[PDB]
Amino acid sequence: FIVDVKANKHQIKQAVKKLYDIDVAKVNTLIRPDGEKKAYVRLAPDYDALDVANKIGII
Amino acid sequence: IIRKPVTVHSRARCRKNTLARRKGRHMGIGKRKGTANARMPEKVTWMRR
Amino acid sequence: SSHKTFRIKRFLAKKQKQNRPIPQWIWMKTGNKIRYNSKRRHWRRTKLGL
RNA sequence: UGGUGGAGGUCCGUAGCGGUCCUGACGUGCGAAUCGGUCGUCCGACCUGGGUAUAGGGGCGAAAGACUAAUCGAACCAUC
RNA sequence: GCCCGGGUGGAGCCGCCGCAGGUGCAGAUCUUGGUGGUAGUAGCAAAUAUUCAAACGAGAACUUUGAAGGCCGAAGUGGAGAAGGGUUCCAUGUGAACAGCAGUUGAACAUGGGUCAGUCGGUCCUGAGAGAUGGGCGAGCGCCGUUCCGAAGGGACGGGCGAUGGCCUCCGUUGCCCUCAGCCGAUCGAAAGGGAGUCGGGUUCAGAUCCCCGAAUCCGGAGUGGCGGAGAUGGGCGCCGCGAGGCGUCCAGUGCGGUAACGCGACCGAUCCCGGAGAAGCCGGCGGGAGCCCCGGGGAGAGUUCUCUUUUCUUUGUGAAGGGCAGGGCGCCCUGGAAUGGGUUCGCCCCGAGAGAGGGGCCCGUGCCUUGGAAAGCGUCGCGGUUCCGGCGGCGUCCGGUGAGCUCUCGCUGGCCCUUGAAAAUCCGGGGGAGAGGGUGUAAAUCUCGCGCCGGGCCGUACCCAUAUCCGCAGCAGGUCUCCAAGGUGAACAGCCUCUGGCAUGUUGGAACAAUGUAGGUAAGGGAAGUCGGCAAGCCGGAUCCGUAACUUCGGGAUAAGGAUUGGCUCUAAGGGCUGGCAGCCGACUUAGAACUGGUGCGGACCAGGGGAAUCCG
RNA sequence: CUGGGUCGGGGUUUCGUACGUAGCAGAGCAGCUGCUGCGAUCUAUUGAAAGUCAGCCCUCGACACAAGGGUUUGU
Ligand SMILES: [Mg+2]
Ligand SMILES: [Mg+2]
Ligand SMILES: [Mg+2]
Ligand SMILES: [Mg+2]
Ligand SMILES: [Mg+2]
Ligand SMILES: [Mg+2]
Ligand SMILES: [Mg+2]
Ligand SMILES: [Mg+2]
Ligand SMILES: [Mg+2]
Ligand SMILES: [Mg+2]
Ligand SMILES: [Mg+2]
Ligand SMILES: [Mg+2]
Ligand SMILES: [Mg+2]
Ligand SMILES: [Mg+2]
Ligand SMILES: [Mg+2]
Ligand SMILES: [Mg+2]
Ligand SMILES: [Mg+2]
Ligand SMILES: [Mg+2]
Ligand SMILES: [Mg+2]
Ligand SMILES: [Mg+2]
Ligand SMILES: [Mg+2]
Ligand SMILES: [Mg+2]
Ligand SMILES: [Mg+2]
Ligand SMILES: [Mg+2]
Ligand SMILES: [Mg+2]
Ligand SMILES: [Mg+2]
Ligand SMILES: [Mg+2]
Ligand SMILES: [Mg+2]
Ligand SMILES: [Mg+2]
Ligand SMILES: [Mg+2]
Ligand SMILES: [Mg+2]
Ligand SMILES: [Mg+2]
Ligand SMILES: [Mg+2]
Ligand SMILES: [Mg+2]
């Protein structure tokens, strides 16, 4: 995901959990050379990423 | 895609010359550049003795 | 430098974002006098101050 | 007398630092001070990075009026 | 100066009477802009070097692939960082401009991508220093000053009062009182100082100690603490029971062992006090351990095979964290008491303030074995997915020896100082003994022991790091801080050649080989007659064995000066370890002597002091 | 039916005696009971081998080539 530079890892985890009613294993955040924060969100093993991406709209 | 073999750099020549030096060749007073102490330190000699 | 501060990185990001050329639909508006981007900066020529 | 030991602002000499001579090259140059051979020193008053202090009639100077951002027998900037 | 004609042009302009002025250019090394001759000229010459074939393409000296010949030569033209740069990184596309020739190429242009951390750093500490308040000064913005002309603590074990919540039990939350007591001065100051804790394998076009897999680890937290184990369960008496074992009274129980160094899995404890670690220079010598190099073999795969070569080359392993054992060190302990002095080092040094000789203890154990761990990695041979695959299979990853060898690291010991070579954060041990627990048990308080539960937020992370990504106006022969470091020769990290890795000759090529240049050489006879002046060039040069003057501050002068030798090959002699005056088995480089031999040549390239006699000055 | 050119062959000349083979030549050394190996060098083949126009001399040997191409010029 792309998030704003004012978000903690805890905030990103909570936002994903509320929005997409899923579980998050961990979060890794970096700040792109162009300015916004990029977040890699690793889900729980019992959730697969492909179906969540389906529900999102990106396939 | 093959990994080419390493170009040969043999040691047969230098090991044959080393065998000659073992026998005592090429070690005359003509073929030596350092001092006697530099070639074989007298302190080390005395230590061993 | 690999070690850099947050504000330095943000300023660099803004400067990098500013370096794109103009959109092709600009030059054929009506009240337009712009032919190209005249503020483009190359890293070899001008050294960004700092 | 023979060993041993391993001192030293010690000697030859690399790396490093410096810059003698050719008054060589170049001299609208590679370069607003470089290049080549040859040179001085190379464990100590040694060489060097970063941090920090000293600001213009002031600083700093193993002292040449030297250095103080290619600017120094008084820096640079703006104004009068 | 002006009026007409012709042409171009496309929207304003002039005559006369007055009024007003920023009103007339050939120059001012005038200002700005433009353009010539020079001139298709100077020039595109620092660091050895390129050639053949094919492909793509309109187009090839410069692109790509293959082959050949070269260079860098481990103090690199290699592999990574710091500062600085800031998208230059990666993929695709283009060839207008730029890359001083060209380009199918680019650090150019155009589209898109790319930097993932509890453990790597910042973040914290303080250093040299910087800087508020109090105070002082100052017309004033302000300045001085950093403990100095200050009521500088907003904390706490515990006790008492008052209220609340939770089974109001016991504790928490406060509010008040009693009691307890320093600060070296707020705060800032290091991406090289201090600073707990992450390693291995795999993966991308570009990211990995960060992603995935697998093994760990530090810190912090937890009403009921989740749990084990420790604190712990004994003795006496009266008994019962044949005894085993079981009852009723008393008493103890904040662990135990070793003579000792000290050991064991824990083994209560506050304010306070003491100490340690953090926390220390430069140089020398020696020893231990790794990595590398080296030698003799087993494999596996390659190279040569005109002749020879049991041949030449490549490869042949195990992380962190535990456990054990080597191996190093001890200014640690016990017995005993030594001259006929002894022990011992390369050197030293040690001993009635207790040596030798026995027996122990402690610390580091980065080495070996094991858990990890063969399951992974790698080298080969063969099958698959005709591919999109951490694909599947066989085999192997073995045995030894040495070294004043190089680098790193640990340790011992000494030398030098009119030089004595940081602070704080943080952590730990001890001395004390204020307190707490229970009355014999369901034991309690308390545990730095074992396992178990939860979490670790924020920022940086791509690439260059330099004869093209930095600074010099630039792809500038300049400058710019570091780590890694093979073989041969050789004293050597010197010079020269080569391997791993890299590169295409430094912003162009072809053909000629005049003068004059720049940079190298060689010259008959003479030998400084040249020149201001032996400027430049030239002679000498390493090592071994002889020999070495005047003068002297007695240390030097000194490599003084001056001589001889140096190759190749075949021998001899001497210099050691381990096991059982001796015997056997291994072995690493040296030194000396001799013979033979070459067209007198032998430090054969490279490296590599000309000398002497005096004067002046310091 | 002539020409040069390339290659080859001779001549000249430079250097100094090639590789291989053989040797009861070789300071010596090791192994097997006189023989076999290592061994710098030496002797014979060996005035040998190699080079020799690119700006040397002759060839009458071989090979292919050579009756071309372009631009101009009138009293
Ligand atoms: Mg630049
Ligand atoms: Mg000296
Ligand atoms: Mg000159
Ligand atoms: Mg000139
Ligand atoms: Mg010297
Ligand atoms: Mg002053
Ligand atoms: Mg003067
Ligand atoms: Mg003045
Ligand atoms: Mg108009
Ligand atoms: Mg006007
Ligand atoms: Mg004019
Ligand atoms: Mg020209
Ligand atoms: Mg490099
Ligand atoms: Mg690199
Ligand atoms: Mg690129
Ligand atoms: Mg060009
Ligand atoms: Mg991890
Ligand atoms: Mg102040
Ligand atoms: Mg700080
Ligand atoms: Mg730090
Ligand atoms: Mg003793
Ligand atoms: Mg395996
Ligand atoms: Mg990187
Ligand atoms: Mg060249
Ligand atoms: Mg070139
Ligand atoms: Mg260049
Ligand atoms: Mg050039
Ligand atoms: Mg002469
Ligand atoms: Mg002569
Ligand atoms: Mg004269
Ligand atoms: Mg001279
Ligand atoms: Mg003298
Ligand atoms: Mg005199
Ligand atoms: Mg002097």
Short mmCIF file of N, CA, C and O (backbone and C1' of nucleotides) in Angstrom, two decimals, chain E residues 240-262:
data_model
loop_
_atom_site.label_atom_id
_atom_site.label_comp_id
_atom_site.label_asym_id
_atom_site.label_seq_id
_atom_site.Cartn_x
_atom_site.Cartn_y
_atom_site.Cartn_z
P C E 240 2.22 -48.13 73.29
"O5'" C E 240 1.36 -48.37 71.98
"C5'" C E 240 -0.02 -48.05 71.95
"C4'" C E 240 -0.56 -48.10 70.54
"C3'" C E 240 -0.06 -49.25 69.69
"O3'" C E 240 -0.75 -50.47 69.94
"C1'" C E 240 0.12 -47.25 68.47
P G E 241 0.08 -51.84 70.11
"O5'" G E 241 0.57 -52.17 68.63
"C5'" G E 241 -0.37 -52.34 67.57
"C4'" G E 241 0.29 -52.23 66.23
"C3'" G E 241 1.55 -53.07 66.04
"O3'" G E 241 1.28 -54.43 65.75
"C1'" G E 241 1.97 -50.88 65.30
P C E 242 1.77 -55.56 66.78
"O5'" C E 242 3.31 -55.24 67.00
"C5'" C E 242 4.06 -55.89 68.01
"C4'" C E 242 5.44 -56.25 67.52
"C3'" C E 242 6.15 -55.17 66.71
"O3'" C E 242 6.79 -54.21 67.52
"C1'" C E 242 6.29 -57.24 65.56
P G E 243 7.17 -52.77 66.91
"O5'" G E 243 8.52 -53.03 66.11
"C5'" G E 243 8.97 -52.11 65.12
"C4'" G E 243 9.32 -52.82 63.84
"C3'" G E 243 9.14 -52.00 62.57
"O3'" G E 243 10.24 -51.15 62.30
"C1'" G E 243 8.13 -54.12 62.29
P A E 244 10.01 -49.58 62.08
"O5'" A E 244 9.47 -49.46 60.59
"C5'" A E 244 10.26 -49.88 59.49
"C4'" A E 244 9.40 -50.24 58.30
"C3'" A E 244 8.48 -49.14 57.80
"O3'" A E 244 9.13 -48.22 56.93
"C1'" A E 244 7.24 -51.12 58.07
P G E 245 9.38 -46.70 57.39
"O5'" G E 245 7.91 -46.10 57.60
"C5'" G E 245 7.00 -45.99 56.51
"C4'" G E 245 5.59 -46.24 56.96
"C3'" G E 245 4.93 -45.13 57.76
"O3'" G E 245 4.40 -44.09 56.96
"C1'" G E 245 4.62 -47.17 58.88
P G E 246 4.23 -42.61 57.56
"O5'" G E 246 3.02 -42.73 58.58
"C5'" G E 246 1.70 -43.01 58.13
"C4'" G E 246 0.75 -43.23 59.28
"C3'" G E 246 0.62 -42.07 60.26
"O3'" G E 246 -0.28 -41.07 59.81
"C1'" G E 246 0.94 -44.08 61.46
P C E 247 -0.31 -39.64 60.53
"O5'" C E 247 -1.16 -39.88 61.86
"C5'" C E 247 -1.33 -38.84 62.81
"C4'" C E 247 -1.81 -39.36 64.14
"C3'" C E 247 -1.60 -38.42 65.31
"O3'" C E 247 -2.62 -37.44 65.41
"C1'" C E 247 -0.85 -40.58 65.90
P G E 248 -2.25 -35.88 65.34
"O5'" G E 248 -1.99 -35.48 66.86
"C5'" G E 248 -2.98 -35.72 67.85
"C4'" G E 248 -2.39 -35.63 69.23
"C3'" G E 248 -1.40 -34.50 69.44
"O3'" G E 248 -2.04 -33.26 69.71
"C1'" G E 248 -0.49 -36.51 70.28
P U E 249 -1.19 -31.90 69.75
"O5'" U E 249 -0.60 -31.86 71.22
"C5'" U E 249 0.22 -30.78 71.64
"C4'" U E 249 1.29 -31.23 72.60
"C3'" U E 249 2.55 -30.39 72.61
"O3'" U E 249 2.41 -29.26 73.45
"C1'" U E 249 3.11 -32.70 72.57
P C E 250 2.75 -27.79 72.91
"O5'" C E 250 4.17 -27.48 73.55
"C5'" C E 250 5.24 -27.06 72.73
"C4'" C E 250 6.54 -27.70 73.14
"C3'" C E 250 7.75 -27.27 72.33
"O3'" C E 250 8.29 -26.05 72.79
"C1'" C E 250 7.72 -29.63 72.54
P C E 251 8.29 -24.76 71.84
"O5'" C E 251 9.76 -24.76 71.24
"C5'" C E 251 10.85 -25.16 72.06
"C4'" C E 251 11.95 -25.78 71.24
"C3'" C E 251 12.16 -25.20 69.86
"O3'" C E 251 12.82 -23.95 69.86
"C1'" C E 251 12.23 -27.55 69.74
P A E 252 12.39 -22.83 68.79
"O5'" A E 252 13.23 -23.22 67.50
"C5'" A E 252 14.64 -23.31 67.58
"C4'" A E 252 15.24 -24.14 66.47
"C3'" A E 252 15.13 -23.59 65.06
"O3'" A E 252 16.03 -22.54 64.80
"C1'" A E 252 14.70 -25.91 65.05
P G E 253 15.58 -21.34 63.83
"O5'" G E 253 15.59 -22.00 62.39
"C5'" G E 253 16.74 -22.68 61.90
"C4'" G E 253 16.39 -23.48 60.67
"C3'" G E 253 15.58 -22.75 59.62
"O3'" G E 253 16.37 -21.89 58.82
"C1'" G E 253 14.62 -24.85 60.00
P U E 254 16.37 -20.31 59.10
"O5'" U E 254 17.12 -19.72 57.83
"C5'" U E 254 16.93 -20.30 56.55
"C4'" U E 254 16.83 -19.25 55.48
"C3'" U E 254 18.09 -18.43 55.25
"O3'" U E 254 19.03 -19.09 54.42
"C1'" U E 254 16.20 -17.00 55.37
P G E 255 20.34 -19.77 55.06
"O5'" G E 255 20.45 -21.17 54.30
"C5'" G E 255 19.49 -22.19 54.50
"C4'" G E 255 19.79 -23.41 53.67
"C3'" G E 255 21.18 -24.00 53.83
"O3'" G E 255 21.32 -24.81 54.98
"C1'" G E 255 20.68 -23.82 51.55
P C E 256 22.76 -24.96 55.69
"O5'" C E 256 23.61 -25.82 54.66
"C5'" C E 256 23.36 -27.21 54.50
"C4'" C E 256 24.08 -27.79 53.31
"C3'" C E 256 25.59 -27.86 53.38
"O3'" C E 256 26.08 -28.92 54.18
"C1'" C E 256 24.95 -27.08 51.26
P G E 257 27.57 -28.86 54.78
"O5'" G E 257 28.51 -29.14 53.52
"C5'" G E 257 28.54 -30.42 52.91
"C4'" G E 257 29.51 -30.48 51.76
"C3'" G E 257 30.96 -30.18 52.09
"O3'" G E 257 31.65 -31.29 52.65
"C1'" G E 257 30.33 -28.96 50.17
P G E 258 32.85 -31.05 53.67
"O5'" G E 258 34.02 -30.45 52.77
"C5'" G E 258 34.65 -31.24 51.78
"C4'" G E 258 35.67 -30.45 51.00
"C3'" G E 258 36.75 -29.77 51.81
"O3'" G E 258 37.79 -30.64 52.21
"C1'" G E 258 35.89 -28.25 50.23
P U E 259 38.26 -30.66 53.74
"O5'" U E 259 38.53 -29.13 54.07
"C5'" U E 259 38.43 -28.64 55.39
"C4'" U E 259 39.56 -27.69 55.72
"C3'" U E 259 39.72 -26.51 54.78
"O3'" U E 259 38.88 -25.43 55.18
"C1'" U E 259 41.83 -27.51 55.25
P A E 260 38.23 -24.46 54.08
"O5'" A E 260 39.48 -23.91 53.26
"C5'" A E 260 40.31 -22.87 53.76
"C4'" A E 260 41.32 -22.47 52.72
"C3'" A E 260 40.72 -22.10 51.38
"O3'" A E 260 40.40 -20.72 51.32
"C1'" A E 260 42.42 -23.71 51.07
P A E 261 39.28 -20.17 50.32
"O5'" A E 261 40.03 -20.06 48.92
"C5'" A E 261 41.10 -19.15 48.73
"C4'" A E 261 41.89 -19.49 47.50
"C3'" A E 261 41.09 -19.52 46.20
"O3'" A E 261 40.97 -18.24 45.61
"C1'" A E 261 42.38 -21.49 46.38
P C E 262 39.62 -17.39 45.77
"O5'" C E 262 38.46 -18.47 45.67
"C5'" C E 262 37.85 -18.79 44.43
"C4'" C E 262 37.63 -20.27 44.30
"C3'" C E 262 36.22 -20.71 43.95
"O3'" C E 262 35.90 -20.60 42.57
"C1'" C E 262 37.01 -21.99 45.75
#
